[PDB]
Amino acid sequence: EYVQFESRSLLSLFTVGKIPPVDAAALCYWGSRDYMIENIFENLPFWTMIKQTNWGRIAIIALPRFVSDLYSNQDDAVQVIIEALEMAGIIGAKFVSLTGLIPSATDYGLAITKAVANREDLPKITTGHRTTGAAVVLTIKKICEQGGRDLSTEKVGFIGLGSVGMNVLPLMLKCLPHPQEITLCDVYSKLEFLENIEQNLVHKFGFKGKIKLALSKTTVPQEIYDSTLIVGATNVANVLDIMQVKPGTLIVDDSGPHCFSVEQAIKRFQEREDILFSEGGMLRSPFPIKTTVHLLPSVEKIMNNAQKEAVFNSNPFNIMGCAFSALLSSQFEQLEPTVGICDGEQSELHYQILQELEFEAGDLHCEHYVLPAKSIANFRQRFGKD
Amino acid sequence: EYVQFESRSLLSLFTVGKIPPVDAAALCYWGEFDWSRDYMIENIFENLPFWTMIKQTNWGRIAIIALPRFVSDLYSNQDDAVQVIIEALEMAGIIGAKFVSLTGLIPSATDYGLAITKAVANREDLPKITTGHRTTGAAVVLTIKKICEQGGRDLSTEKVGFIGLGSVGMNVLPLMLKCLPHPQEITLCDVYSKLEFLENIEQNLVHKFGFKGKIKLALSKTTVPQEIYDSTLIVGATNVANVLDIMQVKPGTLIVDDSGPHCFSVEQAIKRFQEREDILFSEGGMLRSPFPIKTTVHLLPSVAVFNSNPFNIMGCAFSALLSSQFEQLEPTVGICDGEQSELHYQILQELEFEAGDLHCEHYVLPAKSIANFRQRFGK
């Protein structure tokens, strides 16, 4: 109903006026190889989806590279981003979001902004980490509501304090009830960094509860397993043993790839129903989103599997916060685009606007698995607080 | 060398900045293993225009865009042709074209642009259109001059007969009289119903344009009157095809034709010239640029010109670039005046343009055979 496929090229349809221009854009990537890049991707960006929301249209554009291709050569990645930016500006995008690990790979956009120093015709870029942080805070709120708990009585543990983590933590303290304990986990080198936040926690952000610091290589410290609400924003994967966390624990994670075994989490939740876990960066629009989908005609035949036609069954209300950032920056002057390591306290302005438009976090789900409402209720009955 | 193929779509390459924008555009069609007029339109052309060629000249870049229709599809439904023309015009405006020419029989199919310009009355974002008939007439006059020089003859000593005085012909006749030596005799041929028109042209010849020689009139349905075979230089500008028997023309006769389809049998003329070498015949609307044209070619991935003359270019197609580069070269839409082709002949002369080398469709006339003709029938 809300998803419709298109056999004809979206770019060609736009050039002849058959589809209207978009207001924003989002750049994503894929998951022999050279044959796929030059003869399938053709070293060219691909406009694959259009997301019609109640506040504008964002175009989804996939780069002709993989994540490894992005980490291999930064200049090449910046070049393909510049080409996709030219495409987005031509098709009407006023802002372009860097989804996934594109910010982490390209100096959080700064390198890109160097290559655009010459050009002003190109559209503005944004890492979207402030809207992603607002989405993660909305997910904290939602997972507390679904679990029948309140954030004031929770022990919160952070496993990743990157851009997204440094956007979620102060916004959590500012727009949600303060927990009673906060633990900060990152690699050893970040020690001083964590202590800086520690100061900011007690004196700047105004946290009164206990503050703990913990360091790790690839095995999260047990202090996290002693926490009751876990917030993951780590780029490393599978550092959290989901089968070792205490019962009644709530998990919110924006990491992609995730920091815990997805399948083991699904399995524990299906067997015992003693945990809650969900994505962090997913927003739920109050109105359904009309998604126009154009598959690559080549891969249309290898993905002709009716199961691969599951985008026809995706949630019409869900949208990525990082991708929605471009549309937000286009529709609201006050939501300035984020490139590089920004302050992260202006995420409130995004959290404000998202609440103003009656946005909320997407229903509790992790990748392909949506947590069943009755299992959610069973958890909320077994581990809720009165 | 000067033409190079491109495996990826030109539109996508432009969208990413890998090829620069163009200054003009020209709209063509595919002429006339699957359904020709059905599968090719919906699953091959996808009912969308196709940017197939880029012509980089010394005066700008022209984009070649093929419509998802055939020539018959244009005469079948005028509104459908206008719609696909609007879509191609939007594409051309997106890729940078400031003016767009209608090649081939597109004007005759769209009332010479009038229907299109009526549908765009609301719209100003689209680029302006032009039939390009004035530059085509200038090209035909250049071809008259060139075929007279190659044949060792002068136009003043020629008996010229015109077959069909349509839009292009009403541009060729006065420009010929003004910028070339006046012949001593002019014959005018069209259908019988056309006569008062012909007599009007006769008046314009003697009183307006200042022709002093004899003026003859001849009418026909589908068999050109014997008066045309008594002429020494025949100029064909007819939309009907193969109305002039090339095997019936006198020896030593020069023929210049802009008709597409042609008004004489192409293969019979080629083969007669190869056997006897007693005629000269060539296209009328082809110009030869002083500098080579760089042609970027993108073929339909589903599916030659790659050896064509790098100096040759259609006048109707060059019209859009000319109108883009020169304020004085106004676009032609509808049945306009035939005297402003004069300014186009000017501009072409200033840039040192000339008519394309003597050729008919796929066949280039060998120069030394032309020399044999020019001695056998020179003065």
UniProtKB/TrEMBL annotation, chain A:
Q: Where does NAD(+) bind?
A: G100, S104, Y108, S163, V164, D186, K190, S216, T218, T234, N235, D254, G256
Q: Where on this chain does NADH bind?
A: G100, S104, Y108, S163, V164, D186, K190, T218, T234, G256
Put simply, this protein is called Amino acid adenylation domain protein
Q: Species name for this entry?
A: Moorena producens 3L
Span within the parent record: 1908 to 2302 of 2303
